[PDB]
Design an enzyme around this catalytic site. Structure first.
Site, short mmCIF file in Angstrom:
data_model
loop_
_atom_site.label_atom_id
_atom_site.label_comp_id
_atom_site.label_asym_id
_atom_site.label_seq_id
_atom_site.Cartn_x
_atom_site.Cartn_y
_atom_site.Cartn_z
N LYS A 4 -20.06 -17.83 36.54
CA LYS A 4 -18.71 -17.82 35.99
C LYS A 4 -17.74 -17.04 36.88
O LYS A 4 -18.16 -16.21 37.70
CB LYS A 4 -18.76 -17.27 34.56
CG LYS A 4 -19.67 -18.08 33.65
CD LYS A 4 -19.61 -17.57 32.21
CE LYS A 4 -20.36 -18.50 31.27
NZ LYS A 4 -20.24 -18.08 29.84
N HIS B 272 -23.97 -19.02 33.21
CA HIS B 272 -24.22 -20.06 32.25
C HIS B 272 -25.59 -20.63 32.59
O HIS B 272 -25.98 -20.63 33.76
CB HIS B 272 -23.16 -21.17 32.34
CG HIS B 272 -23.59 -22.45 31.69
ND1 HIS B 272 -23.39 -22.70 30.34
CD2 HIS B 272 -24.30 -23.50 32.16
CE1 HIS B 272 -23.98 -23.84 30.02
NE2 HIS B 272 -24.54 -24.34 31.11
N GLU C 5 -25.92 -31.85 31.75
CA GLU C 5 -25.12 -30.90 32.52
C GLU C 5 -25.20 -31.10 34.03
O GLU C 5 -24.19 -31.04 34.73
CB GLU C 5 -25.51 -29.47 32.14
CG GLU C 5 -25.16 -29.12 30.70
CD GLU C 5 -25.35 -27.65 30.36
OE1 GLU C 5 -25.84 -26.88 31.22
OE2 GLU C 5 -25.00 -27.26 29.23
N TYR D 155 -18.05 -28.20 27.88
CA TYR D 155 -18.38 -27.42 26.69
C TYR D 155 -18.07 -28.16 25.39
O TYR D 155 -17.85 -27.53 24.36
CB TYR D 155 -17.64 -26.08 26.71
CG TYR D 155 -18.25 -25.06 27.66
CD1 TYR D 155 -19.50 -24.52 27.41
CD2 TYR D 155 -17.56 -24.64 28.79
CE1 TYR D 155 -20.07 -23.59 28.26
CE2 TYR D 155 -18.12 -23.71 29.65
CZ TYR D 155 -19.37 -23.18 29.38
OH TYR D 155 -19.92 -22.25 30.23
#
Ligand code: ADP
Ligand code: ADP
Ligand code: MG
Ligand code: MG
Lengths: 143, 143
Positions: free
Chosen positions: B10, B116, B127, B50
């Site tokens: 992140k 994450h 993902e 998300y």
């Protein structure tokens, strides 16, 4: 004073599992990775990138090694980045590399010397444009 | 047994200058980075990524944080990778994060927890395909 330079972690760097350690070397020195991409170079890509050595006698092996496995392409940003990068990298021949340099600490031989760095600001611009779109490079603050 | 999972460092991780340290955590624990790409996510991308949290009260903030600066996208490959990755990341809330985990060591708050990790194999496939073409993922032999 802030420049951008190209850095490439060669196949042996990934095989030795030292991607993180190498990146940290730059970060601790103030060289900010503003672009990063793991890629497996094609022969065409390696030859074109290292074209300056086509007349040279190890060129063919250089190309094969460069395409033997994936590499990690990066753009480092910082004051006098081009030079700072060469310093942390160390001499081409690991045997002659200074203490604490990436090559002295990780490089196996002159052929498998773990990293590449632009030799000049002139070549940096070319090398970066070869592998990255301007839109793939992103600076950020250190805080 | 050997699985592939998505890891994202992140925005705060890059600002803290610990990209290398985080990657070394995985490499030393056997999670091999087989795909890496620094990228600045757009609002559309963060929201789409998300989507499972679209009804959660923290969604709007999570999205804003995720696009505040660039991130480093990665696919880790290794034994029980999905679970392994999460164990190494540590608890969502840094306060409850275990000793030696990435979040306890680097995260500042729950809404700025540095990393994450895909929460399941089914979601890992989704993902990874969201951010990487199969041709951008390259496994390689170690030492
Ligand atoms: N004199 C030499 N003999 C053998 N191989 C060499 C020699 N000089 C350079 N090379 C090899 O070719 C590679 C590329 O050369 P160079 O253009 O200096 O780039 P680099 O940043 O990758 O070291 C070197 O890293 C090294 O592996
Ligand atoms: N209760 C919560 N309050 C605030 N933010 C939360 C909360 N739960 C999750 N989040 C945020 O959204 C992300 C959702 O991921 P989650 O699936 O909850 O677990 P994880 O810690 O593995 O990433 C978190 O990492 C955190 O940034
Ligand atoms: Mg040269
Ligand atoms: Mg989760």
């Amino acid at each position: 004073a802030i420049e951008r330079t190209l850095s490439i972690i060669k196949p042996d760097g990934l095989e030795k599992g030292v991607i993180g350690k190498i990146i940290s070397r730059f970060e601790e020195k103030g060289l900010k990775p503003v672009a990063i991409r793991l890629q497996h170079l094609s022969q065409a890509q390696a030859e074109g990138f290292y074209a300056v050595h086509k007349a040279r006698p190890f060129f063919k092996d250089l190309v094969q090694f460069m395409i033997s496995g994936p590499v990690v392409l990066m753009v480092l940003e910082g004051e006098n980045a081009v030079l700072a990068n060469r310093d942390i990298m160390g001499a081409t021949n690991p045997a002659q590399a200074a203490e604490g340099t990436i090559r002295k600490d990780f490089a196996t031989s002159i052929d498998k010397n773990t990293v590449h760095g632009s030799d000049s600001l002139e070549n940096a611009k070319i090398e970066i444009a070869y592998f990255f779109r301007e839109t793939e490079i992103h600076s950020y603050p250190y805080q």
